[PDB]
Short mmCIF file of C-alpha atoms and ligand atoms in Angstrom, two decimals:
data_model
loop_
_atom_site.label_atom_id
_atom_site.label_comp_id
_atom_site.label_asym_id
_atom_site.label_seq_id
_atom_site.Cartn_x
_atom_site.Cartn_y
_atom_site.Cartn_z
CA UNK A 30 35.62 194.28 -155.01
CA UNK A 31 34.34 193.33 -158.69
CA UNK A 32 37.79 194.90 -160.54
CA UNK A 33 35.83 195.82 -164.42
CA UNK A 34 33.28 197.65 -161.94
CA UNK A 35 35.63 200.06 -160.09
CA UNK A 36 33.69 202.70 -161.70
CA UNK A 37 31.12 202.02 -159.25
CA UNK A 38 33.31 203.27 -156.65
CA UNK A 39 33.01 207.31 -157.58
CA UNK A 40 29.07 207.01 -158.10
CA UNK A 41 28.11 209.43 -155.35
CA UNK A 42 23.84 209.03 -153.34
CA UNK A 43 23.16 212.41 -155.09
CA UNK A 44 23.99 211.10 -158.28
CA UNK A 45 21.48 208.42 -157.92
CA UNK A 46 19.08 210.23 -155.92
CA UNK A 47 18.73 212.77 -159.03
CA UNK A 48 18.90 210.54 -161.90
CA UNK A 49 19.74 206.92 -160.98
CA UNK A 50 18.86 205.73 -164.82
CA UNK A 51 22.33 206.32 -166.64
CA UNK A 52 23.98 204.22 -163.91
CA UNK A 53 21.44 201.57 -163.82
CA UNK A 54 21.65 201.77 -167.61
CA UNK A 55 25.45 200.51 -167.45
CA UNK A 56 24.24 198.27 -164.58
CA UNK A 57 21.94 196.18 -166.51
CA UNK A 58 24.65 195.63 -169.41
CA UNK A 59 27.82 195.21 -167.23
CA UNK A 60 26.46 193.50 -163.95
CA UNK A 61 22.92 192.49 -163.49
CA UNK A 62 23.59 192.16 -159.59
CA UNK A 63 26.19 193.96 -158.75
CA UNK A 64 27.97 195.35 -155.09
CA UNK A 65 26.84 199.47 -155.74
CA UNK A 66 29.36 200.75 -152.42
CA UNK A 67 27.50 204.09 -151.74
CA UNK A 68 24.47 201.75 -151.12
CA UNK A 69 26.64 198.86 -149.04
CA UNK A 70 24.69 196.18 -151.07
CA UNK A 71 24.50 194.42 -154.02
CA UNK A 72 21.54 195.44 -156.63
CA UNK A 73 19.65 193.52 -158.85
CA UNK A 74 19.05 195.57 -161.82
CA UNK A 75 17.58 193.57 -164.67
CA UNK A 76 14.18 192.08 -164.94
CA UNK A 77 14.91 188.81 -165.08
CA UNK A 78 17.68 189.06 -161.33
CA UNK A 79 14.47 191.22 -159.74
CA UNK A 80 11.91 188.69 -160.13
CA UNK A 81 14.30 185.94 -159.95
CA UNK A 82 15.18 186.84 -156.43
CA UNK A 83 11.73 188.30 -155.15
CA UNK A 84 10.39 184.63 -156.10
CA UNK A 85 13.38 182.60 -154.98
CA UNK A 86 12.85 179.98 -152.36
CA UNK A 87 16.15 181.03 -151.45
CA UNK A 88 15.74 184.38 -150.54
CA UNK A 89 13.66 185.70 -147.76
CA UNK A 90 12.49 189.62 -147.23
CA UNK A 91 15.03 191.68 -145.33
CA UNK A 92 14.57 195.63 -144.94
CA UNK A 93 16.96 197.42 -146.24
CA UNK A 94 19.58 199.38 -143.81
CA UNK A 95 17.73 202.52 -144.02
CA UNK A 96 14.55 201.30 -143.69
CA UNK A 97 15.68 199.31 -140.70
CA UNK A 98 17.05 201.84 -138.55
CA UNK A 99 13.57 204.10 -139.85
CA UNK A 100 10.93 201.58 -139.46
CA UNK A 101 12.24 199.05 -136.55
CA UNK A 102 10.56 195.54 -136.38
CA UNK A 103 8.29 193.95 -137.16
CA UNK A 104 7.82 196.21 -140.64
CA UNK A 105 5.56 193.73 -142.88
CA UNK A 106 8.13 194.52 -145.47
CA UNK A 107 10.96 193.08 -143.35
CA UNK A 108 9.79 189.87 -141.55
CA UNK A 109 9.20 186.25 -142.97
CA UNK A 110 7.25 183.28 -141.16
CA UNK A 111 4.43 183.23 -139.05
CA UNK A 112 5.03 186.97 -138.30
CA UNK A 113 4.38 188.02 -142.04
CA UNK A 114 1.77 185.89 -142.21
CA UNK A 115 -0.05 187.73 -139.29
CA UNK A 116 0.61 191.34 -140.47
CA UNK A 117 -0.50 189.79 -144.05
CA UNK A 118 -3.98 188.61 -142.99
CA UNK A 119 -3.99 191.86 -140.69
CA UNK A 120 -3.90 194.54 -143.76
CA UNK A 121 -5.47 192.27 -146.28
CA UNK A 122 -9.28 192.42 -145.60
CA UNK A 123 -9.60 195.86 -146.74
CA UNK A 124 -7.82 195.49 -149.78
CA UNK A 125 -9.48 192.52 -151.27
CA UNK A 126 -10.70 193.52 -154.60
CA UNK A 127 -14.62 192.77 -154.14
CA UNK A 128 -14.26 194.92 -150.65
CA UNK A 129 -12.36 198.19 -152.59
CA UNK A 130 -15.24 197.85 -155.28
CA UNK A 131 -17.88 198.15 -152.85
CA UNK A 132 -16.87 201.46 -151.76
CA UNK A 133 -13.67 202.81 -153.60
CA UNK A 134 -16.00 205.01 -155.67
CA UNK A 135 -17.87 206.95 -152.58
CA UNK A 136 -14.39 207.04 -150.81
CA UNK A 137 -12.18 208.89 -153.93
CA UNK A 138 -14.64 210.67 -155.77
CA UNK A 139 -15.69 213.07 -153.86
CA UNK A 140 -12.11 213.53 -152.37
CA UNK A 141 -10.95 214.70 -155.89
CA UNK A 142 -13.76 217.17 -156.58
CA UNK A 143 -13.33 218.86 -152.88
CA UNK A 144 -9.69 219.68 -153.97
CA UNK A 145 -10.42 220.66 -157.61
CA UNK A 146 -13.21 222.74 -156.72
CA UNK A 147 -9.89 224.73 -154.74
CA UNK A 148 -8.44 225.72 -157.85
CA UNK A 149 -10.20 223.99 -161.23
CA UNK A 150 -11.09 227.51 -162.47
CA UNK A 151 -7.81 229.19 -161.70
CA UNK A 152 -6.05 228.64 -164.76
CA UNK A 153 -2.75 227.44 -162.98
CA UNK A 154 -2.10 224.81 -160.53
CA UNK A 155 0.64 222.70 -159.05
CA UNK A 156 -0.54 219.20 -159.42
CA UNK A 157 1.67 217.68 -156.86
CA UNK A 158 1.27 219.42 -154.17
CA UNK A 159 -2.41 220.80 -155.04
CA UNK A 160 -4.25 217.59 -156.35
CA UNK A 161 -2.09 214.20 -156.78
CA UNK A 162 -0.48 214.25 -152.69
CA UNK A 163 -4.09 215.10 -151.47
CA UNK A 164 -6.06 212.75 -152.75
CA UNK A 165 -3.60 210.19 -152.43
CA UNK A 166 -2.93 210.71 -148.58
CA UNK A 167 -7.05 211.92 -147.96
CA UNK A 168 -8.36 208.74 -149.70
CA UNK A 169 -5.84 206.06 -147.43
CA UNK A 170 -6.19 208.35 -144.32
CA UNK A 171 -9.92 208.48 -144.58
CA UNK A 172 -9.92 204.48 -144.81
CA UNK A 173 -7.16 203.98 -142.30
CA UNK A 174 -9.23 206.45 -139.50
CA UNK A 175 -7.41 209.14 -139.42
CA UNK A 176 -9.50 211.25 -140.85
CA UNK A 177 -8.58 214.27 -137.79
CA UNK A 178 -4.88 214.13 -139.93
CA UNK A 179 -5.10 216.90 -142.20
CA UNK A 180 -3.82 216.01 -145.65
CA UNK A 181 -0.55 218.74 -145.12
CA UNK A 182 0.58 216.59 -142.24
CA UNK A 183 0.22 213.30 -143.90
CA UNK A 184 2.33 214.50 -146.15
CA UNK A 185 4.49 216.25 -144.36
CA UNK A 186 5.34 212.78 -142.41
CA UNK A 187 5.84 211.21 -145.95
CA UNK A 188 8.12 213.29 -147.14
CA UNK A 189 10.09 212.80 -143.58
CA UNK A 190 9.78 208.85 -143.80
CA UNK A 191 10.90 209.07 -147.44
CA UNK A 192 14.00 210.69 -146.76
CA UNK A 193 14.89 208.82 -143.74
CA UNK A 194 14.01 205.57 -145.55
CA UNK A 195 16.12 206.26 -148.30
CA UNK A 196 19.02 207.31 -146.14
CA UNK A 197 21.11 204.56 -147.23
CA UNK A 198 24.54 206.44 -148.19
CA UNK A 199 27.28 204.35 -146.29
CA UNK A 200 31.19 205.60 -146.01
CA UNK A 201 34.57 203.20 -146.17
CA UNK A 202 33.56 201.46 -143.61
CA UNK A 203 30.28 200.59 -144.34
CA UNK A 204 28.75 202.91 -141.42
CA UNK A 205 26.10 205.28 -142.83
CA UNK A 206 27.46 208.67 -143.97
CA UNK A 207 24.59 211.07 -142.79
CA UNK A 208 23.10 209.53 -139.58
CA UNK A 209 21.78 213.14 -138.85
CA UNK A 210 19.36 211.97 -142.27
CA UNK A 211 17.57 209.57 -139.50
CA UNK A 212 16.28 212.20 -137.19
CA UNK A 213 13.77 213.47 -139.16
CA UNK A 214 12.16 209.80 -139.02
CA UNK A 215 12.07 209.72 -135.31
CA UNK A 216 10.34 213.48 -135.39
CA UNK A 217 7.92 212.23 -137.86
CA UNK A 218 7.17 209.01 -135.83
CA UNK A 219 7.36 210.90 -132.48
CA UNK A 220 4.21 212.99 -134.01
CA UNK A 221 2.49 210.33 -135.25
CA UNK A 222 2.64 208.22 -131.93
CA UNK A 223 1.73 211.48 -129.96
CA UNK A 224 -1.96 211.25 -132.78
CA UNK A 225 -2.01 207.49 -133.11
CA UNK A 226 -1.93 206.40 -129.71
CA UNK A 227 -5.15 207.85 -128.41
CA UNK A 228 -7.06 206.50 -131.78
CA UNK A 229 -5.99 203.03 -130.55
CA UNK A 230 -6.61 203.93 -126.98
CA UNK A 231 -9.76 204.78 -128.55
CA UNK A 232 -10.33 201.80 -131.00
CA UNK A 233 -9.67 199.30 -128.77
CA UNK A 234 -12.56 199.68 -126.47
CA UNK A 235 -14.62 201.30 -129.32
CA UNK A 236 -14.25 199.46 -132.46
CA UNK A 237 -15.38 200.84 -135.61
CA UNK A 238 -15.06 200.37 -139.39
CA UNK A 239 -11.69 202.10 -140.04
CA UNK A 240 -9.20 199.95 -141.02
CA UNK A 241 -6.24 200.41 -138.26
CA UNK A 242 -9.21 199.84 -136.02
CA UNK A 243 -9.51 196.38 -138.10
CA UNK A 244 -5.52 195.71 -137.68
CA UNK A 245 -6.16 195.93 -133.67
CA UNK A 246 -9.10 192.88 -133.81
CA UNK A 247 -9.90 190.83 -136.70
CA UNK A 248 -8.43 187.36 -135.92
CA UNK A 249 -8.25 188.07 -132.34
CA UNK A 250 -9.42 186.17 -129.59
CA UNK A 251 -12.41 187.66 -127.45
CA UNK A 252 -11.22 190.95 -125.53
CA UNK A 253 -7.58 190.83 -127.27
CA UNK A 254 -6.25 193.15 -129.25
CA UNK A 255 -2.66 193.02 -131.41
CA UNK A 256 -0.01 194.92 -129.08
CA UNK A 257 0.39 198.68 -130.76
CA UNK A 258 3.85 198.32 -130.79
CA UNK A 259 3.42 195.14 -132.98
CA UNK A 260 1.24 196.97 -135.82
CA UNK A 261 2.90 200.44 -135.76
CA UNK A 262 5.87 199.64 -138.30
CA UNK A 263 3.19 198.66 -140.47
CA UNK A 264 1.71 201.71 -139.66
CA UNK A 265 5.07 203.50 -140.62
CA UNK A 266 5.29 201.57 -143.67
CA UNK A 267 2.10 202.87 -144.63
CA UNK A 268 2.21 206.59 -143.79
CA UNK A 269 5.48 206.27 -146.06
CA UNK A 270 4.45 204.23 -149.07
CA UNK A 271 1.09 203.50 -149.23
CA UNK A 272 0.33 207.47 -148.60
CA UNK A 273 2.79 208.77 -151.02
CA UNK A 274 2.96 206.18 -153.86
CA UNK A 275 -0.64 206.77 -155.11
CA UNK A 276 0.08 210.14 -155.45
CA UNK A 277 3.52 209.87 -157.30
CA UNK A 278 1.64 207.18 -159.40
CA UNK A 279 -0.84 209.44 -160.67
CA UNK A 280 2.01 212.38 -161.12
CA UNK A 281 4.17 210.60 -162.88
CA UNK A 282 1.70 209.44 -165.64
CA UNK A 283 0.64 212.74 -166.43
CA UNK A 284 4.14 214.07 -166.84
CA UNK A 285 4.11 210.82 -169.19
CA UNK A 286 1.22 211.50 -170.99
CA UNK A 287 2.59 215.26 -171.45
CA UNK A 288 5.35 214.24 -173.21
CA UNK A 289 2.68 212.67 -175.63
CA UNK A 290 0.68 215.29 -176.25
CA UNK A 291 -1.47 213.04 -179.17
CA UNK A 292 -1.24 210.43 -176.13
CA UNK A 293 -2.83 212.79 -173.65
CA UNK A 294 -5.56 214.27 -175.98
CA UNK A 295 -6.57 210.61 -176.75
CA UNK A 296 -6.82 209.72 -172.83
CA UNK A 297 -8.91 212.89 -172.13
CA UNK A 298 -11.13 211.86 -175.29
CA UNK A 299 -11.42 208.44 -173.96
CA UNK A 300 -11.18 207.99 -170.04
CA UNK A 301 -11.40 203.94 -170.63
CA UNK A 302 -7.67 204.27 -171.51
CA UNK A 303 -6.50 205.37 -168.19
CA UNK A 304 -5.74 202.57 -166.67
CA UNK A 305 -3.80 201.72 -169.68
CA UNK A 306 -1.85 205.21 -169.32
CA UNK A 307 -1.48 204.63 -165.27
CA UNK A 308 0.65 200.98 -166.05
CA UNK A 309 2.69 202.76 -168.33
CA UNK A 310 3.51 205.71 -165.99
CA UNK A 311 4.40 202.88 -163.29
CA UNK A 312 6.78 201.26 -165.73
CA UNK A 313 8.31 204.70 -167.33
CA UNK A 314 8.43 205.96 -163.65
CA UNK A 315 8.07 203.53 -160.85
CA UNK A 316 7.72 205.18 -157.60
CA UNK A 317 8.57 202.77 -155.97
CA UNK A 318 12.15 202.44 -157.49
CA UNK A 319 14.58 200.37 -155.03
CA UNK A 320 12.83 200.08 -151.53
CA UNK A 321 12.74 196.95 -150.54
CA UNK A 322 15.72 194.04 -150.68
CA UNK A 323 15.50 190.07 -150.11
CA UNK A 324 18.41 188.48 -148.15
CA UNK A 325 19.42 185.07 -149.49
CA UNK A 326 19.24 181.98 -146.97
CA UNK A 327 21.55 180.06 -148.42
CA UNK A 328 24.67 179.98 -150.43
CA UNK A 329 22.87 180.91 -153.84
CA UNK A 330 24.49 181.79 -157.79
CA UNK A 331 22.66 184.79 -159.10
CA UNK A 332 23.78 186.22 -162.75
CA UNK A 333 27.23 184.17 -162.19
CA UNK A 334 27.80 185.59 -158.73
CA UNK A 335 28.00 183.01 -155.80
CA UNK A 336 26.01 184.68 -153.03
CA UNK A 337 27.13 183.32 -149.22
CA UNK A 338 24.04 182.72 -147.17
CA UNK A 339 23.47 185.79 -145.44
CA UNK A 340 23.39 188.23 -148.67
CA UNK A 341 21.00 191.26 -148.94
CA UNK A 342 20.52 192.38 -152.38
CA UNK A 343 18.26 195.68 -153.01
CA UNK A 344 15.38 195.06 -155.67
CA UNK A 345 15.24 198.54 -158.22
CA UNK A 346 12.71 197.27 -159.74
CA UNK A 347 12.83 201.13 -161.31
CA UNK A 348 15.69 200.08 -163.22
CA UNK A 349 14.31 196.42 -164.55
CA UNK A 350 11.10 198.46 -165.98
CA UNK A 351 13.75 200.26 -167.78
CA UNK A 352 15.02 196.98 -169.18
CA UNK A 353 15.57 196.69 -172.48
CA UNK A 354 15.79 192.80 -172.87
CA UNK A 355 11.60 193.61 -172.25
CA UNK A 356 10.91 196.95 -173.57
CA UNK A 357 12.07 199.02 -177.06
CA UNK A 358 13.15 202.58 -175.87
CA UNK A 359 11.83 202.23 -172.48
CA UNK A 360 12.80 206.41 -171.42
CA UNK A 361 9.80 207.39 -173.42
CA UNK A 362 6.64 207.11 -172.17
CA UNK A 363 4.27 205.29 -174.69
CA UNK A 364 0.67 204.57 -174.10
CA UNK A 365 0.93 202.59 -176.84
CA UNK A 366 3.46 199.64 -175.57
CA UNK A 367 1.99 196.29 -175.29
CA UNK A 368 0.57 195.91 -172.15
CA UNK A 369 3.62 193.13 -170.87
CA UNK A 370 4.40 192.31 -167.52
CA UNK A 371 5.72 194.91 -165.01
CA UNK A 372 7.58 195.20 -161.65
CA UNK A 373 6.21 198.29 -160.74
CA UNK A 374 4.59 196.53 -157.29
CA UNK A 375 7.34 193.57 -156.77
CA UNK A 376 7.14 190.15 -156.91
CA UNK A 377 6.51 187.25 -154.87
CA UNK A 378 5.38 186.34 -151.36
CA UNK A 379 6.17 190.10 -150.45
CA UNK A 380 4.99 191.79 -153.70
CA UNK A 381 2.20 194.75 -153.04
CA UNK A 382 -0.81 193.96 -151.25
CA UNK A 383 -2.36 197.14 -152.16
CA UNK A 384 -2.46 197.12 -155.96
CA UNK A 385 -6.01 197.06 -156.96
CA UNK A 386 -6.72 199.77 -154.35
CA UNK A 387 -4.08 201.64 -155.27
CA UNK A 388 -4.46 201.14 -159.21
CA UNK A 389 -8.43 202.85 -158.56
CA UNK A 390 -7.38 205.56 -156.33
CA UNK A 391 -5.20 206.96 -159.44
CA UNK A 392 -7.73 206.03 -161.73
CA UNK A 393 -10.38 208.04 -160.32
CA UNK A 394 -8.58 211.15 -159.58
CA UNK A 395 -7.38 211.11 -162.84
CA UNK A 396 -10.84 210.49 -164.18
CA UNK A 397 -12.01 213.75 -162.42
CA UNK A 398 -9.24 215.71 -163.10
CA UNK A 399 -9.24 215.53 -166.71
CA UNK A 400 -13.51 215.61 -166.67
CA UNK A 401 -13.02 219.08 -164.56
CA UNK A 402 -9.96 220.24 -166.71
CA UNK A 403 -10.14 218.80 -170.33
CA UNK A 404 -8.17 221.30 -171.52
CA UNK A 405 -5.17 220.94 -169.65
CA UNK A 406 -1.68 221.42 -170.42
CA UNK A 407 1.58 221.07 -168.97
CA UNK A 408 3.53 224.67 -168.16
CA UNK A 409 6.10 224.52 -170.46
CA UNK A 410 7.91 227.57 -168.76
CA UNK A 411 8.76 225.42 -165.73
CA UNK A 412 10.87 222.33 -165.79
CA UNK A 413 9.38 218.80 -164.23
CA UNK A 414 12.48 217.46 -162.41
CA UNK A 415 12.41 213.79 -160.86
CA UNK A 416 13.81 213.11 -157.95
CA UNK A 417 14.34 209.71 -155.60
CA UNK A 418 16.45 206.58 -155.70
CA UNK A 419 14.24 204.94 -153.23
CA UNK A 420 10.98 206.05 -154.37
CA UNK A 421 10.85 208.27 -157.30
CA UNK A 422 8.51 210.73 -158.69
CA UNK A 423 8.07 214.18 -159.61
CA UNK A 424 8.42 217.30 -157.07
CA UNK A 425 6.24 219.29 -158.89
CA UNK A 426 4.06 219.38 -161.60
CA UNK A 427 3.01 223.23 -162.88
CA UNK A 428 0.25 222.90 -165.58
CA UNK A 429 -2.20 225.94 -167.48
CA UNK A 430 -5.50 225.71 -169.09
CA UNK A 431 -7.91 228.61 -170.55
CA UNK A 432 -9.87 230.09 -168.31
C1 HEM B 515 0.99 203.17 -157.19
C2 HEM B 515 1.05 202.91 -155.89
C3 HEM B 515 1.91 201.75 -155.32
C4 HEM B 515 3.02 201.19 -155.83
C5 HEM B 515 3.75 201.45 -157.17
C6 HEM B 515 3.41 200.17 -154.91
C7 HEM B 515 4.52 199.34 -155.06
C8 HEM B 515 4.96 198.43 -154.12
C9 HEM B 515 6.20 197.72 -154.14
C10 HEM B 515 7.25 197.75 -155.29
C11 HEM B 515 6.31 197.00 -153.00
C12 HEM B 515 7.46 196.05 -152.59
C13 HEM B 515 7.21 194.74 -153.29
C14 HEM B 515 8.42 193.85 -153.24
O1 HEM B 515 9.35 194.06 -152.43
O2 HEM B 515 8.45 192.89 -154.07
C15 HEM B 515 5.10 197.23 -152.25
C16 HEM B 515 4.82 196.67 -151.01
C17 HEM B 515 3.65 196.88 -150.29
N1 HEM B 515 2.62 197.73 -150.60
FE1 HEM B 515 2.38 198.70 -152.41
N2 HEM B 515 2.56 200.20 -153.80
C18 HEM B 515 1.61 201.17 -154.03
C19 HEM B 515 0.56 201.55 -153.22
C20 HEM B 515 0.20 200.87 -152.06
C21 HEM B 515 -0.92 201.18 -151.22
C22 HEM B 515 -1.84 202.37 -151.53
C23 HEM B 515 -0.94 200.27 -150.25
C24 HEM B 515 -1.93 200.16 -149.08
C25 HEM B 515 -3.21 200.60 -149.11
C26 HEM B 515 0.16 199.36 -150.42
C27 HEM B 515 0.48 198.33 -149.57
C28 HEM B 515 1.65 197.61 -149.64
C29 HEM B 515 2.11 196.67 -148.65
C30 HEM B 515 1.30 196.27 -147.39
C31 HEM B 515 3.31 196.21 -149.03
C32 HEM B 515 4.20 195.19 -148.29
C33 HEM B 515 3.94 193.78 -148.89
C34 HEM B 515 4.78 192.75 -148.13
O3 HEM B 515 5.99 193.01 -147.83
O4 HEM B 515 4.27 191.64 -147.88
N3 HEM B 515 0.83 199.74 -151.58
N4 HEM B 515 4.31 198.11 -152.92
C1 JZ3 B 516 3.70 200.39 -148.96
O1 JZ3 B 516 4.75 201.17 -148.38
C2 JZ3 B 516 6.02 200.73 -148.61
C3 JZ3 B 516 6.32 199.71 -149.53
C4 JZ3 B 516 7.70 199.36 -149.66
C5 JZ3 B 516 8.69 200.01 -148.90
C6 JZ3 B 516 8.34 201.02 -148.00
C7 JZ3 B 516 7.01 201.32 -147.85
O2 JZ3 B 516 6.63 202.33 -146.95
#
């Protein structure tokens, strides 16, 4: 135990669940990776420790406790080798840029406008739950094949998966503290087996263009298929993540661009600058905030702390978009910063695979949104809270317009 951090010892999972950024703030300046106890594991916190140890030839993916006991093996997040490389070439086909701009268009669009046209004219709405979870879990469900899941169930499961996920909180002994927080997981992936497994029964004697369809044959020999229980972490890890980050994405920069009102006005004027305002909300915001962790294979020094071999450290990369060796008041949201680099989708061998698709999906919907409701405005009445350690975003998101 680090003696100048024994502060660290009284910072509590619902302190960081609800606002991890004044503790990361001190982290940053006192202890760039430091051992956090509630969390069991040291944290990288800066910039520079993140992308020093998702690139390190030293350090190999590991899934973090949580995630582990939630998502099982082999989750493409937690595996290194020839089994990465497998799930790798298995979810990459569909996400290779010239492939998402030969359809993303026909597959998003018209998503967005079906749930505008539910309440465009109302005058109120609740963006998260009405417009940015939708089209975010409708537009990956639709290209995944499950197009039967209604977009309440997919997220529904999220939300589940989140929580268990990010069930990390560990007592004295390094046990976990709420192991009743895991049995919401194994609901939502009972469910999802009990609607998955007759799509692959399906799938594999019928093969078609969806993409889990895909997972189950490309690179297979004739007649084969990859096992189900091979691909359905990866399945997990998408009906967490790659449903709900899109979504929080696209939230989060409009609670940005609210807080800048000459900011938003001058993205609804010009729509070009969206993508600008979208990598800004992932910095200010990043919903994916501390998910994933690399374990060190060797004895390794990191910001003056000798590692043993054998070492997970969490990456919050939430925390080094906050840093301020990088970025001049990084709390506000600014449209305006210089477009640097960002950690918003990792680093490395394991960073995101699904950026381009998932940088388009929040681009259109918040193309349509602000063509179908130019005059939009945030409800002032109601207060935006943020909430997540693991992934972060916004759990609601009340706006008004004249009708
Ligand atoms: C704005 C939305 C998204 C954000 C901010 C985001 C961010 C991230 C981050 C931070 C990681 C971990 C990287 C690391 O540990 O270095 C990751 C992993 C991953 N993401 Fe994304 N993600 C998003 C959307 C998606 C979507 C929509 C998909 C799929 C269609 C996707 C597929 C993946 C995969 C497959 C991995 C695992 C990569 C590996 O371990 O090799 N992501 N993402
Ligand atoms: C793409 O989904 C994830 C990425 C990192 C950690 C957990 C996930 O479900």
């Amino acid at each position: 135990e680090r003696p100048d951090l024994a502060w660290l010892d009284e910072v509590t999972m619902t302190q960081l669940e609800r606002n991890p950024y004044e503790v990361y703030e001190r982290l940053r300046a006192e202890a760039p990776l430091a051992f956090v106890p509630v969390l069991g594991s040291y944290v990288a916190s800066t910039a520079e420790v993140c992308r020093e140890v998702a690139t390190s030839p030293d350090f190999e993916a590991v899934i973090t406790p949580a995630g582990g006991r939630t998502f099982g093996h082999p989750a493409i997040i937690g595996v290194n080798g020839d089994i990465h490389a497998d799930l790798r070439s298995m979810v990459e086909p569909a996400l290779q840029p010239a492939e998402v701009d030969r359809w993303i268009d026909d597959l998003v669009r018209p998503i967005a406008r079906r749930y505008l046209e539910r309440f465009e004219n109302d005058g109120h709405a609740e963006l998260v739950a009405q417009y940015c979870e939708p089209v975010s879990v409708r537009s990956l469900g639709d290209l995944l094949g499950l197009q039967e899941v209604d977009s309440d169930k997919l997220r529904e499961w999220f939300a589940k998966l989140n929580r268990s996920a990010t069930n990390a909180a560990v007592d004295e002994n390094g046990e976990f503290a709420n192991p009743e927080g895991f049995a919401e997981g194994d609901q939502a992936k009972a469910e999802i087996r009990a609607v998955v497994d007759p799509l692959i029964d399906k799938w594999i004697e019928h093969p078609d263009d969806s993409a889990i369809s895909h997972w189950l044959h490309d690179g297979m020999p004739p007649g084969q298929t990859r096992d189900r229980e091979y691909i359905y972490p990866t399945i997990y890890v998408y009906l967490l993540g790659a449903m709900q980050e899109p979504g929080h994405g696209m939230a989060s920069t409009l609670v940005g661009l609210f807080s800048r009102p000459e900011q938003l006005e001058e993205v609804v004027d010009d729509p070009t600058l969206i993508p600008r305002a979208i990598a800004e909300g992932l910095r200010w915001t990043s919903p994916i905030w501390s998910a994933t962790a690399r374990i060190s294979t060797k004895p390794v020094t990191i910001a003056g702390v000798d590692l043993p071999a054998g070492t997970p450290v969490m990456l919050s990369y939430g925390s080094a978009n906050h840093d301020t060796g990088k970025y001049e008041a990084p709390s506000q949201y600014d449209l305006h910063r210089p477009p640097l680099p960002h950690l918003a989708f990792g680093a490395g061998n394991h960073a995101c695979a699904g950026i381009y698709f998932a940088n388009h999906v929040m681009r259109i919907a918040l193309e349509e949104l602000f063509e179908a409701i130019p005059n939009l405005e945030r409800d002032t009445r109601e207060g935006v809270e943020f909430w997540g350690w693991g992934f972060r975003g916004p759990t609601s998101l009340h706006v008004t317009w004249e009708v």
